[PDB]
Ligand binder design. Structure first.
Ligand SMILES: CC(C)[C@H](NC(=O)[C@H](C)NC(=O)OCc1ccccc1)C(=O)N[C@@H](Cc1ccccc1)[C@@H](O)[C@H](O)[C@H](Cc1ccccc1)NC(=O)[C@@H](NC(=O)[C@H](C)NC(=O)OCc1ccccc1)C(C)C
Ligand SMILES: Cc1ccc(S(=O)(=O)NC(=O)Nc2nccs2)cc1
Ligand SMILES: Cc1ccc(S(=O)(=O)NC(=O)Nc2nccs2)cc1
Lengths: 99, 99
């Protein structure tokens, strides 16, 4: 769509044959999702934000669908309290900020 | 104008006399800038994200220019490593996500 920001920009995502809600985030370099089993091998990673760092597992070339828009790319899993769609995936669905 | 997301969506702001860069951040509720000098009476406030939380200072009715769009709102001030423009001002300047 064209989505307003009066309300948080949380959309429906599909990943792993599971439906989740996530936040379209121009403030995130990377896509980080709450704890979930996922296929293939991973590598260790840290991400930072407000008030420090946390550890995550990087998985590559993952199929995700975001309001019906398919993308394959990197997805990180760990103790985020919010499912976040970051720029690496927002680009793949054509997402822009406009005003 | 249009901001595609291949790089961090950075923009020029003008606030309390000064020129700065700040990130347009759709997953930020509030606006939060690096330590600076704003006027008069402020209240404590707590904001958190990945990894933890910070203590900030809340300044209300602060005037700000964001990419030539004027806005008046709550600016938060504290130890964030990046200046963040949140939905509180993104809404005032007519900012939406398009895909
Ligand atoms: C989502 C992350 C992957 C993202 N991180 C990155 O992309 C980082 C910079 N990149 C990165 O880590 O890459 C690898 C790296 C980096 C540096 C060194 C080595 C390796 C990030 O945290 N980005 C944040 C900005 C930032 C950048 C640098 C440093 C510090 C902060 C926000 O823009 C991003 O949009 C998040 C989303 C979020 C929110 C909550 C939990 C988890 C994620 N918002 C926030 O952190 C904001 N918090 C909020 O908006 C919350 C929801 N509000 C809040 O506390 O409100 C009051 C409240 C109080 C009490 C209860 C409830 C609410 C903040 C900017 C205002
Ligand atoms: C676009 C899109 C379709 C379907 C999903 S799904 O139902 O969550 N799971 C999968 O497709 N898994 C996979 N199948 C083959 C390789 S990875 C997610 C995203
Ligand atoms: C459009 C635009 C003009 C001027 C500015 S300014 O010089 O940075 N600030 C102000 O003039 N006044 C205030 N700042 C804080 C409270 S009242 C900012 C934006």
């Amino acid at each position: 769509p064209q989505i307003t920001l009066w309300k948080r920009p949380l959309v429906t995502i599909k990943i792993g044959g599971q439906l989740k809600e996530a936040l379209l985030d121009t403030g995130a370099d990377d896509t980080v999702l709450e704890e979930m089993n996922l296929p293939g091998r991973w590598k260790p990673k840290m991400i930072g934000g407000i008030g420090g760092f946390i550890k995550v597992r990087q998985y590559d070339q993952i199929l995700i669908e975001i309001c019906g828009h398919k993308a394959i790319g990197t997805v990180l899993v760990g103790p985020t309290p919010v499912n976040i769609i970051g720029r690496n995936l927002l680009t793949q669905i054509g997402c822009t900020l406009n005003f």
